[PDB]
Each structure stands twice: as C-alpha cells, then as structure tokens.
Amino acid sequence: AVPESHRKILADIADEVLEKFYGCGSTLPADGSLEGATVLDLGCGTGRDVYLASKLVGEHGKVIGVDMLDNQLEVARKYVEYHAEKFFGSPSRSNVRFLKGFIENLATAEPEGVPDSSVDIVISNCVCNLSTNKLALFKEIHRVLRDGGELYFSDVYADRRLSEAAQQDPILYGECLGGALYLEDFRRLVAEAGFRDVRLVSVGPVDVSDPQLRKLVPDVQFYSCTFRCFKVATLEATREDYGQSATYLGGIGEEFKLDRFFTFPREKPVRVDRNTAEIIRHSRLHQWFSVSAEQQHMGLFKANDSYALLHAPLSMQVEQLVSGAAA
Numbered sequence: 001a002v003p004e005s006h007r008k009i010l011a012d013i014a015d016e017v018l019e020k021f022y023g024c025g026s027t028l029p030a031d032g033s034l035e036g037a038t039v040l041d042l043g044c045g046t047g048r049d050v051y052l053a054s055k056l057v058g059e060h061g062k063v064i065g066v067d068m069l070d071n072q073l074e075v076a077r078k079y080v081e082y083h084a085e086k087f088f089g090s091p092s093r094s095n096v097r098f099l100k101g102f103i104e105n106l107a108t109a110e111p112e113g114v115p116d117s118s119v120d121i122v123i124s125n126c127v128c129n130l131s132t133n134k135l136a137l138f139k140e141i142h143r144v145l146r147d148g149g150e151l152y153f154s155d156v157y158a159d160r161r162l163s164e165a166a167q168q169d170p171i172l173y174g175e176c177l178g179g180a181l182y183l184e185d186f187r188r189l190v191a192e193a194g195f196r197d198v199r200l201v202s203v204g205p206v207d208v209s210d211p212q213l214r215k216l217v218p219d220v221q222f223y224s225c226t227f228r229c230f231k232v233a234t235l236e237a238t239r240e241d242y243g244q245s246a247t248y249l250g251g252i253g254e255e256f257k258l259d260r261f262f263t264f265p266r267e268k269p270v271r272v273d274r275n276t277a278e279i280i281r282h283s284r285l286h287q288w289f290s291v292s293a294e295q296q297h298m299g300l301f302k303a304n305d306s307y308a309l310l311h312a313p314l315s316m317q318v319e320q321l322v323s324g325a326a327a
C-alpha cells in the first residue's frame with residue numbers, strides 16, 4: 001500500500017486532511033491513466049483520496065467526494081481553495097466538489113445528485129464493508145459509471161462467512177470487520193450488480209489486535225484488497241481465449257501493470273483473454289494500447305504464466321497470493 005508516485009502528492013496535502021483520514025490501502029492506480037478522468041470517492045471523509053485524485057486527474061479532470069457526515073465534509077471543504085492553489089498554482093481553479101449523501105443513493109445527494117453514466121472511475125477506501133445493503137450499493141456504482149468506466153477500490157474482506165453473532169456485534173462492525181464480505185459473496189454480489197469481471201490488484205492480511213474482538217471471529221482470516229471492476233457490456237463470467245494479444249504503447253510508464261495477472265511492457269505484445277482485450281478496448285486505456293483482432297475460439301485462456309489461478313475462484317487467487325512473508 002501507498003506507492004512512491006503518490007507519496008510526493010501526499011506530502012503536499014493539508015495536515016488536517018491527513019491526520020483525520022481512516023483508510024484501508026490505496027484506492028488509486030499508480031500509472032498516469034487518470035489525466036482528465038472524472039473520479040468519485042464514496043465515503044470520501046476528510047478528503048485525502050479526493051485531493052490525491054485531484055492532482056492525478058489534473059486540471060482537466062474532476063473529483064467529486066461523497067459522504068454522509070456534515071463534520072467530515074466540513075474539513076474536506078475547508079481545503080478546496082487551499083489545494084487548488086497547491087496543485088494548479090491558483091485557488092478557485094480546483095476540480096474538486098463535495099456532495100452530502102448516502103452512497104447507496106447518489107441520486108438524492110446534495111446539493112445535486114449523481115446522474116447515470118457520469119463517472120469514469122469510482123473509488124472508495126474501506127467504506128463498502130460498512131454498508132447495510134451491498135447489492136444496492138454495487139448497483140448504484142454500476143448505474144453512475146459510464147461504459148468503459150470502472151470501480152477501483154479498497155476494502156476489507158474475509159476468509160469465510162462470519163457467524164450470526166459476529167455480524168450483529170456493533171464494535172466489530174464499527175471496527176470495519178463485521179460488515180466485511182466473504183470474498184466469494186463479494187464476487188457473487190458484484191456480478192449480480194452488473195460486473196462479471198473482478199480484477200485483483202493488491203492484497204495483504206489484516207490482523208485482529210484486540211483479543212476480545214478476535215473471540216467473535218475465532219478462525220477467520222481477514223484481508224485488505226484492491227479490485228478493478230470495469231463496466232463494459234461485453235464482459236463474460238469466464239476468461240476466453242480468442243488468440244489475441246495487446247501491446248502497451250508507452251507514454252505513461254516503462255510498463256503498464258493491469259492486475260496481478262497482467263503486466264504489459266512497452267512494445268511487447270502480451271497475450272490476453274477476450275475479457276481483457278474488451279476492457280483495454282472500451283475503457284480509457286485504449287489510448288496507450290493496440291489490441292489484436294479476435295481469432296477462432298480456443299477455450300479457456302492459457303497464454304499466461306499463472307493461467308491456472310486466473311481461473312481459480314477469487315478466495316483462492318487471494319490465499320495463494322497471500323502465503324508469502326518471503327519479501
């Protein structure tokens with residue numbers, strides 16, 4: 001969590017915003033794909049990720065932050081002109097806006113609601129676990145994303161389904177663990193919400209400090225996970241080989257790392273499943289890519305070193321990535 005291209009921008013961010021930020025990991029890609037995008041942070045809080053996003057999307061982009069708590073947004077807003085000046089040489093030239101609302105129902109957020117297909121990228125940091133109606137939430141994300149858009153986001157997940165007890169406990173819930181999805185239910189909910197393709201970006205385990213909290217969660221292993229879920233009509237629930245390849249064309253990195261399974265060296269054509277090709281093709285990523293035309297259909301994609309895992313269920317991709325304190 002927290003790469004070095006971001007670490008420079010953090011430094012420039014207001015003290016108050018930083019001291020009052022309560023985050024999971026990184027909910028922002030490090031690769032320069034953001035220039036000019038419209039970002040929306042769900043449960044933005046005091047505005048760390050928003051202001052971070054504000055630099056990355058640059059002068060031509062937009063960041064909208066959304067939160068329910070008057071007091072959190074109070075802090076956030078206080079630093080609009082501040083950061084406008086700090087990043088673009090002038091106050092009153094910021095690309096940052098804040099709405100008051102519940103993330104399950106962005107159409108009624110204030111001062112104005114978030115219309116359909118108005119957002120390139122939706123991010124959130126450690127927020128979604130707190131929601132009492134996840135399907136509604138993921139459906140809301142699907143609604144506001146444009147086609148080609150994606151949900152890039154951090155949150156806390158689980159090895160397994162917690163007990164009835166564990167799920168009712170408010171200390172646990174508030175500690176961000178009680179509302180944490182079993183990884184398999186997550187895959188299922190988000191597919192039901194319209195996202196048939198879930199890309200793992202980074203994990204790392206989440207310890208349980210307080211032993212009295214652990215009592216409710218005896219054997220459960222928790223994780224922190226960042227996931228891309230592009231909204232592209234033609235995605236499928238399986239990753240199919242149409243013999244294609246993609247070639248990253250440079251202009252935003254030596255490489256381009258898409259998710260744990262896919263990295264594209266500048267001018268190396270890399271073999272991709274049709275799902276991947278579609279994503280690259282229909283999202284903003286097309287600018288720094290060319291994608292081969294689809295051949296005949298060879299069954300489930302294999303042209304990848306870890307192709308075995310690429311087809312394994314989500315909770316296995318994770319566990320098998322996680323075993324490894326060999327740094």
Ligand SMILES: C[S@@+](CC[C@H](N)C(=O)[O-])C[C@H]1O[C@@H](n2cnc3c(N)ncnc32)[C@H](O)[C@@H]1O
Pocket residue numbers: 020021022023042043044045046047048049066067068069072101102103104124125126127130131
């Ligand atoms: C984990 S914390 C703060 C993390 C925040 N993303 C940050 O980096 O500062 C929970 C935050 O999400 C907000 N929140 C929780 N549930 C929400 C909901 N249904 N709608 C809007 N905001 C919510 C809380 O107000 C609080 O700002």
